[PDB]
Amino acid sequence: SSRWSKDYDVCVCHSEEDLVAAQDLVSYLEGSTASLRAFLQLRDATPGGAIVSELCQALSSSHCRVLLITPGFLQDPWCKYQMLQALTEAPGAEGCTIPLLSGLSRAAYPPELRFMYYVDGRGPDGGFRQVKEAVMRYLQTLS
């Protein structure tokens, strides 16, 4: 059998500042826990110019995604314009991301995020690791 069913299963979009974290948390599931194949596609230095790529269905082909960033960094226009896919430009119920926030009242993230999510991980309670528990709540769909 060569014909594949999907190209991407899980993607962890985060800053290189936590390259070790994303790889540490992903390593847990990669083992014999979730039995999935997650990949980290960090921003790469473009060759120069930049065009408007067609609808990236690949990003929507994924099942789940882990998003871990700061309230000050995510506040940037790049993160907002990039996360636009998770804001409104989403598939429907796939490629869902889990943005971790440290007790933010819509001060760091836009109002578009308004939904039945409720960002958790406020104060120094180990929000970083909490990202692993967040993705665990998504598996509930496979019950």
Side-chain angles (χ1 to χ4, degrees), residues 7-88:
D7 308 338
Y8 296 137
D9 304 73
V10 182
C11 186
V12 49
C13 177
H14 84 317
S15 176
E16 76 297 323
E17 295 309 332
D18 261 31
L19 80 164
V20 179
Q23 109 183 359
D24 176 53
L25 53 92
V26 75
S27 169
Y28 270 99
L29 307 329
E30 273 208 290
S32 43
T33 315
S35 204
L36 285 163
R37 181 156 52 186
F39 55 94
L40 48 150
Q41 181 63 89
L42 260 55
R43 50 246 269 179
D44 274 87
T46 31
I51 55 166
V52 180
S53 202
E54 72 192 33
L55 272 295
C56 288
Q57 62 183 355
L59 291 166
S60 283
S61 197
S62 44
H63 314 289
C64 45
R65 297 168 87 166
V66 185
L67 223 146
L68 39 150
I69 30 168
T70 25
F73 197 49
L74 95 90
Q75 96 201 341
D76 278 14
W78 192 256
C79 275
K80 150 61 217 301
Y81 262 97
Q82 199 269 127
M83 76 188 197
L84 94 168
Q85 67 232 332
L87 304 199
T88 327

XYZ file of all heavy atoms in Angstrom, residues 7-88:
625
model
N -1.550 13.778 4.695
C -0.170 14.242 4.621
C 0.335 14.668 5.995
O 1.489 14.423 6.347
C -0.055 15.408 3.637
C -0.672 15.091 2.289
O -0.803 13.893 1.963
O -1.023 16.043 1.560
N -0.536 15.307 6.768
C -0.177 15.771 8.103
C -1.186 15.281 9.138
O -2.385 15.208 8.868
C -0.102 17.298 8.132
C 0.981 17.867 7.243
C 0.742 18.986 6.454
C 2.241 17.286 7.190
C 1.728 19.510 5.639
C 3.233 17.803 6.380
C 2.972 18.915 5.606
O 3.957 19.432 4.796
N -0.690 14.946 10.325
C -1.546 14.465 11.403
C -1.588 15.467 12.552
O -2.662 15.839 13.025
C -1.050 13.110 11.909
C -0.959 12.076 10.805
O -0.042 12.185 9.963
O -1.803 11.157 10.781
N -0.412 15.900 12.996
C -0.315 16.859 14.090
C 0.845 17.824 13.872
O 1.949 17.412 13.511
C -0.131 16.149 15.445
C -0.076 17.164 16.576
C -1.248 15.142 15.674
N 0.590 19.108 14.096
C 1.613 20.132 13.924
C 1.704 21.023 15.160
O 0.688 21.481 15.683
C 1.311 20.983 12.689
S 2.602 22.183 12.285
N 2.927 21.262 15.622
C 3.151 22.097 16.796
C 3.824 23.411 16.416
O 5.047 23.480 16.290
C 4.018 21.372 17.842
C 5.252 20.770 17.188
C 4.409 22.326 18.962
N 3.017 24.451 16.236
C 3.534 25.765 15.870
C 3.876 26.580 17.113
O 2.988 27.019 17.844
C 2.513 26.518 15.017
S 3.017 28.196 14.570
N 5.170 26.778 17.347
C 5.630 27.540 18.502
C 6.944 28.251 18.196
O 7.556 28.023 17.153
C 5.804 26.619 19.710
C 7.126 25.917 19.742
N 7.702 25.347 18.626
C 7.987 25.694 20.762
C 8.859 24.802 18.960
N 9.055 24.999 20.251
N 7.373 29.114 19.112
C 8.612 29.862 18.937
C 9.823 28.979 19.221
O 9.749 28.041 20.014
C 8.629 31.083 19.858
O 9.863 31.775 19.765
N 10.938 29.286 18.566
C 12.166 28.520 18.746
C 12.662 28.621 20.186
O 13.490 27.823 20.624
C 13.250 29.017 17.787
C 13.885 30.330 18.212
C 12.891 31.476 18.242
O 12.005 31.515 17.363
O 13.000 32.333 19.144
N 12.149 29.606 20.916
C 12.541 29.810 22.306
C 12.176 28.598 23.158
O 12.696 28.422 24.260
C 11.869 31.065 22.869
C 12.322 32.350 22.199
C 13.832 32.486 22.158
O 14.501 31.935 23.056
O 14.343 33.144 21.228
N 11.280 27.766 22.639
C 10.846 26.570 23.351
C 11.026 25.326 22.486
O 10.324 24.329 22.659
C 9.381 26.705 23.773
C 9.232 27.134 25.220
O 10.116 27.862 25.716
O 8.232 26.739 25.856
N 11.970 25.393 21.555
C 12.243 24.273 20.661
C 12.425 22.979 21.448
O 12.085 21.896 20.970
C 13.494 24.554 19.825
C 14.834 24.307 20.520
C 15.959 24.240 19.499
C 15.109 25.393 21.550
N 12.959 23.099 22.659
C 13.182 21.940 23.515
C 11.875 21.452 24.131
O 11.659 20.250 24.281
C 14.181 22.259 24.644
C 14.379 21.046 25.540
C 15.507 22.727 24.064
N 11.006 22.393 24.485
C 9.720 22.060 25.081
C 8.825 21.328 24.085
O 8.322 20.242 24.370
C 9.030 23.318 25.588
N 8.632 21.932 22.917
C 7.799 21.338 21.879
C 8.270 19.928 21.538
O 7.458 19.035 21.293
C 7.804 22.213 20.634
N 9.585 19.735 21.525
C 10.162 18.432 21.213
C 10.042 17.484 22.401
O 9.981 16.267 22.232
C 11.631 18.585 20.813
C 12.603 18.051 21.854
C 14.052 18.275 21.468
O 14.345 18.812 20.400
N 14.966 17.865 22.339
N 10.009 18.052 23.602
C 9.895 17.257 24.820
C 8.468 16.749 25.007
O 8.250 15.582 25.334
C 10.319 18.082 26.035
C 10.117 17.338 27.340
O 10.622 16.202 27.458
O 9.455 17.892 28.243
N 7.500 17.635 24.798
C 6.093 17.277 24.944
C 5.643 16.363 23.810
O 4.906 15.401 24.028
C 5.226 18.538 24.973
C 5.416 19.509 23.806
C 4.429 19.203 22.691
C 5.261 20.947 24.280
N 6.091 16.668 22.596
C 5.737 15.872 21.428
C 6.330 14.470 21.517
O 5.762 13.509 20.997
C 6.221 16.539 20.126
C 7.726 16.376 19.970
C 5.487 15.960 18.926
N 7.476 14.359 22.182
C 8.148 13.075 22.338
C 7.303 12.117 23.173
O 7.350 10.902 22.980
C 9.518 13.268 22.992
O 10.077 12.026 23.382
N 6.534 12.674 24.101
C 5.680 11.871 24.968
C 4.619 11.133 24.157
O 4.454 9.919 24.285
C 5.008 12.756 26.019
C 5.813 12.900 27.292
C 6.598 14.024 27.518
C 5.787 11.913 28.269
C 7.335 14.159 28.678
C 6.519 12.040 29.433
C 7.292 13.165 29.633
O 8.024 13.297 30.791
N 3.902 11.875 23.319
C 2.856 11.293 22.485
C 3.459 10.440 21.373
O 2.946 9.368 21.054
C 1.985 12.396 21.881
C 1.387 13.396 22.871
C 1.132 12.729 24.214
C 2.304 14.598 23.036
N 4.552 10.923 20.789
C 5.224 10.203 19.715
C 5.524 8.765 20.127
O 5.571 7.864 19.291
C 6.523 10.915 19.328
C 6.335 11.996 18.277
C 7.578 12.216 17.438
O 8.570 12.748 17.977
O 7.558 11.858 16.242
N 5.727 8.557 21.425
C 6.020 7.228 21.927
C 4.836 6.289 21.807
O 4.262 6.137 20.728
N 4.469 5.656 22.917
C 3.350 4.722 22.931
C 2.196 5.270 23.766
O 1.614 4.558 24.585
C 3.795 3.366 23.483
O 4.634 3.527 24.613
N 1.870 6.541 23.551
C 0.787 7.186 24.283
C -0.374 7.529 23.358
O -1.486 7.032 23.531
C 1.270 8.471 24.983
O 2.525 8.235 25.631
C 0.248 8.948 26.004
N -0.108 8.383 22.375
C -1.131 8.791 21.420
C -1.027 7.989 20.127
O -2.008 7.838 19.399
C -1.017 10.281 21.129
N 0.167 7.476 19.849
C 0.400 6.692 18.642
C 0.185 7.542 17.393
O -0.450 7.104 16.432
C -0.527 5.475 18.611
O 0.017 4.440 17.812
N 0.718 8.758 17.413
C 0.585 9.671 16.283
C 1.947 10.200 15.847
O 2.964 9.925 16.484
C -0.334 10.838 16.650
C -1.830 10.526 16.696
C -2.577 11.603 17.469
C -2.391 10.392 15.288
N 1.959 10.962 14.758
C 3.197 11.530 14.237
C 3.094 13.048 14.126
O 2.565 13.574 13.148
C 3.523 10.929 12.869
C 4.821 11.446 12.270
C 5.407 10.457 11.273
N 4.431 10.058 10.262
C 4.662 9.121 9.349
N 5.828 8.491 9.320
N 3.725 8.812 8.462
N 3.603 13.746 15.136
C 3.570 15.204 15.152
C 4.855 15.788 14.576
O 5.924 15.187 14.681
C 3.344 15.711 16.568
N 4.744 16.963 13.965
C 5.897 17.628 13.371
C 5.917 19.110 13.732
O 4.867 19.732 13.905
C 5.880 17.463 11.849
C 4.605 17.933 11.210
C 4.497 19.223 10.717
C 3.514 17.086 11.102
C 3.324 19.659 10.128
C 2.340 17.516 10.514
C 2.246 18.804 10.026
N 7.115 19.669 13.847
C 7.273 21.079 14.189
C 7.810 21.871 13.000
O 8.958 21.696 12.594
C 8.215 21.232 15.385
C 9.526 20.447 15.311
C 10.622 21.170 16.078
C 9.334 19.038 15.851
N 6.972 22.742 12.449
C 7.363 23.562 11.308
C 7.629 25.001 11.738
O 6.765 25.870 11.606
C 6.275 23.531 10.234
C 6.617 24.347 8.998
C 7.835 23.815 8.267
O 7.723 22.952 7.396
N 9.007 24.329 8.617
N 8.828 25.248 12.253
C 9.209 26.582 12.704
C 9.465 27.504 11.516
O 9.895 27.058 10.453
C 10.456 26.508 13.585
C 10.215 26.555 15.095
C 9.242 25.465 15.514
C 11.530 26.419 15.850
N 9.203 28.793 11.707
C 9.406 29.778 10.651
C 10.820 29.684 10.086
O 11.801 29.745 10.828
C 9.151 31.189 11.186
C 9.892 31.494 12.478
C 8.931 31.685 13.639
N 8.528 33.081 13.794
C 7.684 33.503 14.728
N 7.157 32.642 15.588
N 7.366 34.788 14.804
N 10.917 29.536 8.770
C 12.210 29.435 8.104
C 12.503 30.691 7.290
O 11.589 31.344 6.787
C 12.246 28.203 7.196
C 12.650 26.947 7.941
O 11.760 26.288 8.520
O 13.855 26.620 7.944
N 13.784 31.025 7.165
C 14.196 32.202 6.412
C 13.865 32.051 4.931
O 14.461 31.232 4.230
C 15.685 32.453 6.599
N 12.907 32.844 4.460
C 12.495 32.797 3.062
C 13.645 33.176 2.137
O 14.614 33.817 2.542
C 11.304 33.736 2.795
O 11.362 34.862 3.679
C 9.985 33.005 2.986
N 13.536 32.774 0.861
C 14.559 33.062 -0.149
C 14.608 34.541 -0.518
O 15.615 35.030 -1.029
C 14.114 32.227 -1.352
C 12.643 32.062 -1.176
C 12.408 32.006 0.309
N 13.514 35.250 -0.253
C 13.455 36.666 -0.563
C 12.033 37.166 -0.718
O 11.401 37.575 0.256
N 11.527 37.138 -1.948
C 10.174 37.597 -2.204
C 9.133 36.758 -1.490
O 9.465 35.786 -0.813
N 7.867 37.136 -1.640
C 6.773 36.411 -1.005
C 5.461 36.635 -1.749
O 5.056 37.774 -1.983
C 6.636 36.834 0.450
N 4.802 35.542 -2.118
C 3.535 35.621 -2.834
C 2.392 35.059 -1.996
O 2.614 34.496 -0.924
C 3.597 34.860 -4.173
C 4.037 33.413 -3.941
C 4.544 35.560 -5.137
C 3.815 32.514 -5.138
N 1.169 35.214 -2.492
C -0.009 34.719 -1.790
C -0.309 33.274 -2.170
O -1.056 33.012 -3.113
C -1.247 35.585 -2.091
C -2.462 35.060 -1.342
C -0.978 37.040 -1.732
N 0.277 32.338 -1.431
C 0.076 30.919 -1.693
C -1.408 30.563 -1.643
O -2.168 31.135 -0.863
C 0.848 30.076 -0.677
O 1.088 28.770 -1.173
N -1.810 29.613 -2.481
C -3.202 29.181 -2.534
C -3.656 28.644 -1.180
O -2.880 28.600 -0.225
C -3.385 28.107 -3.609
C -2.785 26.763 -3.235
C -2.714 25.808 -4.410
O -2.518 26.283 -5.549
O -2.854 24.587 -4.193
N -4.919 28.238 -1.105
C -5.478 27.703 0.132
C -4.682 26.495 0.613
O -4.687 25.441 -0.024
C -6.943 27.313 -0.075
C -7.972 28.418 0.168
C -7.970 28.839 1.629
C -7.695 29.613 -0.733
N -3.999 26.654 1.741
C -3.197 25.576 2.309
C -4.086 24.536 2.985
O -4.292 24.577 4.197
C -2.191 26.136 3.315
S -0.831 27.060 2.563
N -4.609 23.608 2.191
C -5.478 22.559 2.713
C -4.702 21.612 3.622
O -5.275 20.977 4.507
C -6.113 21.775 1.563
C -5.102 21.062 0.680
C -5.749 20.346 -0.488
O -6.974 20.293 -0.598
N -4.927 19.789 -1.371
N -3.395 21.522 3.398
C -2.540 20.653 4.198
C -2.660 20.982 5.682
O -2.789 20.086 6.518
C -1.093 20.774 3.744
N -2.618 22.270 6.004
C -2.721 22.717 7.388
C -4.078 22.349 7.980
O -4.219 22.204 9.194
C -2.509 24.229 7.474
C -1.091 24.725 7.188
C -1.086 26.229 6.963
C -0.155 24.352 8.328
N -5.073 22.195 7.112
C -6.420 21.844 7.549
C -6.600 20.329 7.591
O -7.552 19.823 8.185
C -7.459 22.466 6.615
O -7.622 23.849 6.882
N -5.678 19.612 6.957
C -5.736 18.156 6.918
C -5.345 17.561 8.268
O -5.696 16.423 8.582
C -4.814 17.616 5.825
O -5.130 16.272 5.507
N -4.616 18.338 9.061
C -4.173 17.888 10.376
C -5.364 17.643 11.296
O -6.454 18.170 11.073
C -3.234 18.921 11.002
O -3.730 20.236 10.823
N -5.148 16.838 12.332
C -6.203 16.521 13.288
C -6.153 17.467 14.484
O -7.168 18.050 14.871
C -6.075 15.074 13.761
C -5.848 14.097 12.648
N -6.824 13.754 11.738
C -4.746 13.392 12.300
C -6.335 12.877 10.879
N -5.075 12.642 11.197
N -4.969 17.613 15.067
C -4.787 18.486 16.222
C -3.448 19.212 16.148
O -2.542 18.795 15.427
C -4.872 17.677 17.517
S -3.935 16.132 17.486
N -3.331 20.303 16.899
C -2.103 21.090 16.917
C -1.880 21.717 18.290
O -2.831 22.077 18.983
C -2.157 22.183 15.848
C -2.235 21.643 14.429
C -2.574 22.742 13.433
N -1.381 23.434 12.954
C -1.372 24.234 11.894
N -2.485 24.444 11.207
N -0.245 24.829 11.521
N -0.615 21.844 18.678
C -0.265 22.427 19.967
C 0.412 23.782 19.792
O 1.511 23.873 19.244
C 0.668 21.500 20.769
C 0.926 22.071 22.155
C 0.077 20.101 20.861
N -0.251 24.834 20.260
C 0.287 26.186 20.156
C 0.692 26.718 21.527
O -0.147 26.883 22.413
C -0.745 27.118 19.518
C -0.213 28.088 18.463
C -1.254 28.324 17.381
C 0.197 29.404 19.107
N 1.982 26.987 21.694
C 2.499 27.502 22.956
C 3.343 28.752 22.729
O 4.443 28.679 22.182
C 3.331 26.433 23.665
C 4.211 25.562 22.766
C 5.454 25.108 23.513
C 3.427 24.363 22.252
N 2.821 29.898 23.154
C 3.527 31.163 23.000
C 3.237 32.100 24.167
O 2.472 31.767 25.072
C 3.144 31.865 21.684
C 1.707 31.515 21.294
C 4.109 31.475 20.575
C 1.152 32.385 20.187
N 3.852 33.279 24.139
C 3.659 34.267 25.193
C 2.605 35.294 24.799
O 2.276 35.461 23.624
C 4.974 34.998 25.525
O 5.856 34.956 24.398
C 5.654 34.368 26.731
N 2.063 36.002 25.800
C 1.039 37.028 25.581
C 1.595 38.262 24.880
O 0.866 38.980 24.195
C 0.580 37.380 26.999
C 1.742 37.041 27.868
C 2.409 35.857 27.224
N 2.891 38.503 25.054
C 3.522 39.651 24.430
C 3.946 39.375 23.001
O 3.889 40.260 22.147
N 4.375 38.144 22.741
C 4.813 37.755 21.405
C 3.618 37.534 20.483
O 3.577 38.052 19.366
C 5.659 36.481 21.475
C 6.484 36.242 20.243
C 7.271 37.252 19.713
C 6.472 35.008 19.614
C 8.031 37.035 18.579
C 7.231 34.784 18.481
C 8.010 35.800 17.961
N 2.647 36.763 20.958
C 1.449 36.473 20.177
C 0.701 37.756 19.830
O -0.071 37.795 18.872
C 0.529 35.525 20.949
C -0.585 36.185 21.763
C -1.843 36.336 20.921
C -0.874 35.381 23.021
N 0.935 38.802 20.615
C 0.284 40.087 20.389
C 0.740 40.704 19.071
O 0.054 41.555 18.503
C 0.583 41.044 21.545
C 1.748 41.982 21.272
C 2.347 42.553 22.542
O 1.715 42.547 23.598
N 3.575 43.051 22.445
N 1.900 40.271 18.591
C 2.447 40.781 17.339
C 1.475 40.548 16.186
O 0.593 39.692 16.250
C 3.789 40.112 17.034
C 4.940 40.759 17.776
O 4.677 41.545 18.710
O 6.106 40.482 17.422
N 1.637 41.329 15.108
C 0.783 41.228 13.922
C 1.022 39.938 13.144
O 0.100 39.385 12.543
C 1.195 42.441 13.083
C 2.592 42.738 13.508
C 2.669 42.371 14.965
N 2.262 39.463 13.160
C 2.621 38.237 12.457
C 1.858 37.043 13.021
O 1.243 36.280 12.276
C 4.126 37.989 12.556
C 4.614 36.916 11.632
C 4.963 35.639 11.969
C 4.809 37.026 10.218
N 5.364 34.949 10.850
C 5.277 35.778 9.762
C 4.632 38.058 9.291
C 5.570 35.537 8.423
C 4.924 37.817 7.962
C 5.388 36.565 7.538
N 1.902 36.888 14.339
C 1.216 35.785 15.003
C -0.291 35.867 14.775
O -0.958 34.850 14.588
C 1.518 35.796 16.502
S 3.046 34.940 16.952
N -0.821 37.086 14.795
C -2.248 37.303 14.591
C -2.647 36.987 13.153
O -3.629 36.284 12.912
C -2.618 38.749 14.927
C -3.794 39.279 14.126
C -5.053 38.466 14.379
C -5.876 38.304 13.110
N -6.279 39.618 12.538
N -1.879 37.508 12.203
C -2.153 37.282 10.789
C -1.923 35.820 10.416
O -2.588 35.283 9.531
C -1.271 38.185 9.926
C -1.970 39.439 9.451
C -1.818 40.642 10.131
C -2.780 39.423 8.323
C -2.455 41.790 9.701
C -3.419 40.566 7.885
C -3.254 41.748 8.578
O -3.889 42.890 8.147
N -0.978 35.184 11.100
C -0.659 33.786 10.841
C -1.683 32.864 11.495
O -2.114 31.877 10.901
C 0.743 33.456 11.356
C 1.341 32.202 10.737
C 1.034 30.953 11.538
O 0.531 29.966 11.002
N 1.339 30.989 12.830
N -2.068 33.193 12.724
C -3.042 32.395 13.459
C -4.452 32.631 12.926
O -5.418 32.045 13.416
C -2.986 32.729 14.951
C -3.643 34.054 15.302
S -3.354 34.540 17.014
C -4.619 35.790 17.229
N -4.562 33.491 11.920
C -5.854 33.805 11.320
C -6.602 32.531 10.938
O -7.831 32.502 10.926
C -5.664 34.687 10.085
C -5.586 33.957 8.743
C -5.685 34.945 7.591
C -4.298 33.152 8.649
N -5.849 31.480 10.630
C -6.441 30.203 10.250
C -7.202 29.587 11.419
O -8.214 28.913 11.227
C -5.357 29.238 9.767
C -4.393 28.809 10.862
C -2.942 29.017 10.476
O -2.591 28.990 9.296
N -2.088 29.226 11.472
N -6.709 29.822 12.630
C -7.344 29.292 13.830
C -8.417 30.244 14.350
O -9.250 29.865 15.174
C -6.302 29.029 14.906
N -8.389 31.479 13.864
C -9.360 32.487 14.281
C -10.670 32.329 13.518
O -11.710 32.021 14.102
C -8.793 33.891 14.060
C -7.460 34.192 14.747
C -7.239 35.694 14.846
C -7.414 33.552 16.126
N -10.614 32.540 12.206
C -11.796 32.420 11.362
C -11.528 31.516 10.163
O -12.393 30.748 9.748
C -12.268 33.797 10.857
O -11.994 34.800 11.841
C -13.757 33.778 10.544
